Design a protein around this ligand. Sequence first.
Ligand code: HEM
Lengths: 498, 498, 498, 498
Amino acid sequence: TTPHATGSTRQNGAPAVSDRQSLTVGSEGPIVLHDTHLLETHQHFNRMNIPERRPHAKGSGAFGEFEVTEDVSKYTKALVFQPGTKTETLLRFSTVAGELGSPDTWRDVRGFALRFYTEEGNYDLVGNNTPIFFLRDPMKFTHFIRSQKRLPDSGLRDATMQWDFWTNNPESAHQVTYLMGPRGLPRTWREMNGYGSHTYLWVNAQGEKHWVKYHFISQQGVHNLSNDEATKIAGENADFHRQDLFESIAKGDHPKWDLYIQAIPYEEGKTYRFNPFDLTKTISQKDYPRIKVGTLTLNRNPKNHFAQIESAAFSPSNTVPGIGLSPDRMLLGRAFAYHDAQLYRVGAHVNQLPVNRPKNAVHNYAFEGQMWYDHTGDRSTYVPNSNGDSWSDETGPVDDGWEADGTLTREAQALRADDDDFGQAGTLVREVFSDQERDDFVETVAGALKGVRQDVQARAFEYWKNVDATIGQRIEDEVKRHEGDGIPGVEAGGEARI
Amino acid sequence: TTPHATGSTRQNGAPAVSDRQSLTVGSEGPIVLHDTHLLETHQHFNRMNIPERRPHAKGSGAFGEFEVTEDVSKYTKALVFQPGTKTETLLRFSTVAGELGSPDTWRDVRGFALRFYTEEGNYDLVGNNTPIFFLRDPMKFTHFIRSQKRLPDSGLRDATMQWDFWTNNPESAHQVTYLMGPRGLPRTWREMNGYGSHTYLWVNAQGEKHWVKYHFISQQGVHNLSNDEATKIAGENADFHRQDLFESIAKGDHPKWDLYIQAIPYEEGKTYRFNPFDLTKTISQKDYPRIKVGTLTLNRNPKNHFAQIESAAFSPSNTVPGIGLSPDRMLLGRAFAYHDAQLYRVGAHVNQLPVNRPKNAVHNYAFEGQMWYDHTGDRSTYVPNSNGDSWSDETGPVDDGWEADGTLTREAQALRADDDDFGQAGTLVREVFSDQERDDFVETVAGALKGVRQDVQARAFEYWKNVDATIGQRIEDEVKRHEGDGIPGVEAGGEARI
Amino acid sequence: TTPHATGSTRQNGAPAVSDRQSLTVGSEGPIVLHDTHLLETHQHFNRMNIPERRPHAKGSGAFGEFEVTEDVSKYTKALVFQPGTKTETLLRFSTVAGELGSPDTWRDVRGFALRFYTEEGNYDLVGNNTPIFFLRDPMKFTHFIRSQKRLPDSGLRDATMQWDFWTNNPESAHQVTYLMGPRGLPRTWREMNGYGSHTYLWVNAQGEKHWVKYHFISQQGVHNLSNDEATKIAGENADFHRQDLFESIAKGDHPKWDLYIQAIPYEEGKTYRFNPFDLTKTISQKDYPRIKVGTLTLNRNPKNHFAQIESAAFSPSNTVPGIGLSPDRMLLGRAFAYHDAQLYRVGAHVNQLPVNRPKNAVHNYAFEGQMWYDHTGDRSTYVPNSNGDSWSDETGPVDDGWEADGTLTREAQALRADDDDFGQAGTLVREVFSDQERDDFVETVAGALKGVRQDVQARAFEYWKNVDATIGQRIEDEVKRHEGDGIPGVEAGGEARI
Amino acid sequence: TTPHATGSTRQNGAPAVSDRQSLTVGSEGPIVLHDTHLLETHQHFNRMNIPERRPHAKGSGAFGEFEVTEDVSKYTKALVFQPGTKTETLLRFSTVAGELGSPDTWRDVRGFALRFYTEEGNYDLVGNNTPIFFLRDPMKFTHFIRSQKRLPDSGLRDATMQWDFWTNNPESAHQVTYLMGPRGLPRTWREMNGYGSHTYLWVNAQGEKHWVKYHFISQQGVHNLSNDEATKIAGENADFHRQDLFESIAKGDHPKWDLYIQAIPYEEGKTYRFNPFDLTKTISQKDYPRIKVGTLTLNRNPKNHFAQIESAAFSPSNTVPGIGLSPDRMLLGRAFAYHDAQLYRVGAHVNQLPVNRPKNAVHNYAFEGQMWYDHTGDRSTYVPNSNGDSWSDETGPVDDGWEADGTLTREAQALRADDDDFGQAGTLVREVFSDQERDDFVETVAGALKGVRQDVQARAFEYWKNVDATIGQRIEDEVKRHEGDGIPGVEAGGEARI
Ligand code: HEM
């Protein structure tokens, strides 16, 4: 308490006088220009909103801990995964297509973005609730996400646009099958699995390399909603998943996931019968079994959602020694894209915000810019220098690299022995799903096609028969009878759509 | 078609080569840094989103025409309202609290933002679907909107926060009554009325002044949804109102509103028994009857929702000769706030975008800045100048002014004879509502209070009894029995709320 | 040192590997897209620059201390000026017209921007090296600064534009005289005086008010350069003043200024023979003598020029209890303008950067926005609230206010008994300047008019004769003979100018 | 003229009333918040400045025409270079290190940025006034430019920092020699040559490839200033070069350059004795002679410097069919960097501003974003689509590609037979310079080393002896006697520098 305090301050720390009445010429007069508290508070209010993420705008998260309980030191030198290591984490969950205020229970992919605050930097494993994705080249991703959003004239989501894109990009079949199956509607974020999806590189202390897949298996199980249930919840509680996570942690019910990897020897990655660098493919667990690493626990809610969750900036470029990227084109595009988006969304100094700062000392050659909170004093701005300010200069092949040879080209990845666009989707439908799941799948896909322009429907019938002839005919028969479920979040047809 | 065309271009107009595959070192190699088409398209994608409006993020609109059919020339010299004049319009409708992807059918105020493209500039009448508002001083508005949005930790909307603000700001009673009544849930935007809410100033050719209220009465009638219906629609079709407007216009069903004004002689504005400069008050139609002006028709959908609707920038500062502001503190704060927000949301040159440009010639002393599309060539940048580049220099009292006298103060407006916080709300509940509307009102208010922290509930019981003793007791009795409707868009209680 | 350290890190804290070579496919191959260190460092480099200040882009500063050595407690309750108080300060000096890289020794006004880090907030006294300014209404300021900058087509500064503006705004005469006199070219910033220029309000503990002027009198004296010397230095050392200040402090030569005020009783401000609210007027020291307050010492250089000086954000709105604004229209426009500019130049959270943070606790109703470093946790976002988070609600006349009465108008300030545009300038030329200063003045003004378009020259001859008939004829005679000094920073004439 | 016009408008097109007086409560009262014209004009003024370019902030330009007068169709299919073709151009000249207001005649590299508005897109040849550059890997460029700018604490340029960087990066020797020679100080931009510097790829109609160098040889000759002359001009006219170009064109004196190429057969680029992909190397004209293409004429000044020159956005990524990049690492980094910078400096839609738009039709998959002036209507946002909106999908090796093979590495380029860091610099000093140029060179280099920290001086003596033993000893002898010229724009020594 200062001597002239009034209960709150302006931005300069001086007493504000009133948070409730403007400065006027008498009670009945106009507001004067020099009501600086009115101006400061309104100008700030007008700058509170920041661009929402594209994609994955709607989401929430929590802090936790990861504990290593197995010895995988023969596979990586990364500090975070050494025996017995416990690391603080942050996890943000999200949908993909919907905007900031959109219902949580729309049918969609869910994000699973996990940061480990390691002793050698922030390691981000930016995953999804599926082991695969719709595409295998990042040039197509902009198109895909735009097709999942809104028509340019009416501003409506449109299943015709969605199916036009999917049927003209048959590489999408594996993930469209997974999305249209049970797991398209998680009951809660606690009751879904997380995956890295991509192949990553692990490098051990001797320089030996393995290609790895990450799998986070929920200790709460996998539980899903029906289309009808999810539609009902979208109306009753648009923030159902956000509320569930916060309430669960507040009550002491800390959700857990066990991490397993698959580890492929370096040379076998080049010869395996499915392309491990193709994001539309899973790798068989009969060929490369899951190996346990440790357990993730979420146990602490945010104190401020905007500062800790909305302003968090995750990136697959945030690797640490012992972990690298891979020849997966999609992953390589992601190495550029996230940081770029965050410079616009948050700001140049996004990585100086507390939630994005690493625990270890940063000594980075970047200076100045807007909103530079932690300046470098008189440190040298160039290298080499004669002033004792260190720099890096390792020469030669990098520890997390690989070989390439060819001419500059734009073409599809070469096919391995068993690669195609529809086989793995067919295995999912025929061998993994139960009879009841298959029945529900038909009703979901048929519903998703209701009202779709007939030319696009016809292409969808061929697409589904390519996945499985029996399921495809069942879908076609139901579409021709105009049957099927309503799908939460999207429809087709009418004068405002294609 | 250029000789080396490929089907699309980069931003410089050169052939893009592929919109589907990235540039790699052989089919199996990494993406190269110099895939400039990948970079341009991803960097643009990452900058597509702009901050959503605060408030009124969720909305849509259409173009139309306004036709003057009466002679109100004795009241204003504004060109747009002279006899027989037809003017092109743009109208954006919206909710208030929810974000970009939020359901259209939440209980809320609706915006009614109307632009007239006049021969003497763009005239914006930025109204709502209610003649009043919650507050009478703009210092409180930031607080109010934050209370209608989300809790800082959990990110959830919370009825306890909403009622804590309303009960501690009893000036809100008139509009809270209107919001909790039938009109809180319009069936469609076509089936709601629009209002200017504020008193504005009209000035005629002789300089005579009248205080005016604007009323847009729907030719489609006023039709509303129940809480249960609106909740159901929120789940089934989050864009119901947006879809309805677009489809209606596309089918040729052009919605209309008739404009009426109330006209108060200048001196009577200072003595009237309710304060016309208090936005929480209506002016009796027995004292000042409605006078017809003309008819608004909406008849054309946008070609591009983002460019024409999302990027539209409406402002009450966009007056034209013959129409001015008034001593209403809320209006005077709005004269500053919109343009300020738009400089951040869209950009410095927001008013050069086609939808925001006026039809008449702009000759304005503003130069340079980012994204300056229509430059001024070698025009003088200062005034007076000796180069023949004109400027304005009218001296003396302005035609759209008024008098003031007093000392600089922060205090409430003085009360007129019949001014108070609860009387007009009481008239609405007792005399305007039917028995069925009163019954529904009790169920709505009781529902809105379910789960609210008990101290805040107790203050709400006193608030409602101040409006009407009978309705207040009915609400209290239902709250104590834990009865009432679910309210679309909000709830209270639980570990994630207050 | 982490186990895999290389000498520097990326932004996530992981080893950077090399600050000297890019990631390529072999030594001879292309750079890959996933060189994340190349991308991070280049994207940051590309965002290092921020908009320069407009005006006052070119400048530098230092930290120091202010010590009160007199008792002025009968005049103000402000903590910073109570007996014996010592306060940390920051001072930025600058020119006005030139851009970031422009020479320090151009003829121009110099800024004198002083921050006191008080126990009741940051108090900014944003002054200049002159007691007056060119204008008395802020509407003209945009025009004035544009006239001092560059022609729209050629990008050159132009004396014709400068004189066209000055001669058509005769209120400028007092300050143009001061600028064209000796003090237009300070030798160093240490050897110039500083002034608040405007009348400010001081309020004591009993609520009694005085109008005050601030004067900072250099203990190093006032020393100036000739036009020829300053031109020579502009070529030899464009950063002469910046270098001088830094070197002087580094050598232990701490420059000092003594602060004096003039104190006008509240009622006398309304009746005084020169308008104290007209920024083009000085107040006679025979009528209101200077009263000593204390001494300012600069004694510490910045550690980082960009973070501490370039990113500093000074504003006349940063008052503290005991000190207020005044009816000076120019000051009232400044209360809005600085904070507005800083939101664009630096960012919404400009006042959270260390150099802009106050020493006392900030409790302000502003939340969210880009780059929010110091979040508010779960503090209530609205007022009043029932959660114990305080707010301000003082009602009634403010302690730093005054009275007004009238109709809304756009017109010049009424003239006091002795007010005019040329009298004070004439006193300066006839009574204050020495013979040698008058001789130099003629050569400066004549030089400044060389090459100016003849119609504008003719108006300038009348302007100068209005100041003083003898000096005006001397200037005219020299201009007609094409004599006069070269003026550092500007010229006229030729095919690229008016 | 509208009926109520006053001489100028607000941004909405309504009469502004006054560009000279603010809206107040009586003549003596405060400014009201609702002076919307004051607010609009000041908010715009506060947003006029945009970040200056980094590097090359200080510059100007003109429009012209390029005319092909020879037949080089066997070497390229690019439309702009086909026989007889005339193309509109824009050329911006600049320095490198100094900021927006810095003198034109500092010793520095000059930029030569040329746009051709071709029928197949905007082709930008972003060159300099030297055939080489200081570095051969873009990772070092950020460091280099920071070393040429200012010290972090004092804000001064410092020759010690400059020489510390150069001597620790000996690849710089060739260009440092050129900079310190006669051509470091062009008399005018009309009297300097322009170069592409890098090797580019040309592809003919049959797909045959040649590596090319571009040389623009001034028809006005090469003329330079001494250090002393340039220092004098920096003080007298900081905009000498800008003024010269504008005045010359205005008087009808249109400067010309003849374009010549060197053409290296594709396979010879891999075996040549100097690395054509190393930007620090020239290619001998005895081995690959210059071949004339045509003539560039500048003949039209800008109408608005800010809109046409400051807001121009040039990029080496703006290739057209027939012209590609090359394996030069520096060029490949530039393909990313310019567009990235321009998104921050100007905006997402930088390429929709008139000066940046191509002449041919743009059909690009980019939508939305701030300040989207030319929208795409209802065009499909995804590909392939079934709506007739075209896209590109060429598969296989690109016409402007090449081969690569290797492992991911960070290392220096392999040396060709005659590659080293000092040989070409030595040829310049011994064989190209005259005796008088050598004498002046010694005085320039010695002057540039005056005051430099002794350890860095000692390294510079070794550096220069590596260039040439005789010149190096001459420089050392002069430095030890503290002799040498003052260098315009930079110095060393003293308490404010290293
Ligand atoms: C002092 C009180 C108010 C403040 C400070 C205020 C401020 C704002 C702001 C900053 C925006 C966003 C503008 C943009 O980004 O383009 C907005 C939107 C809007 N406000 Fe207000 N408002 C207030 C009162 C009102 C009232 C009383 C009404 C109705 C009479 C109203 C109707 C609207 C509408 C319809 C929109 C959306 C315009 C559109 O569709 O783009 N506001 N308001």
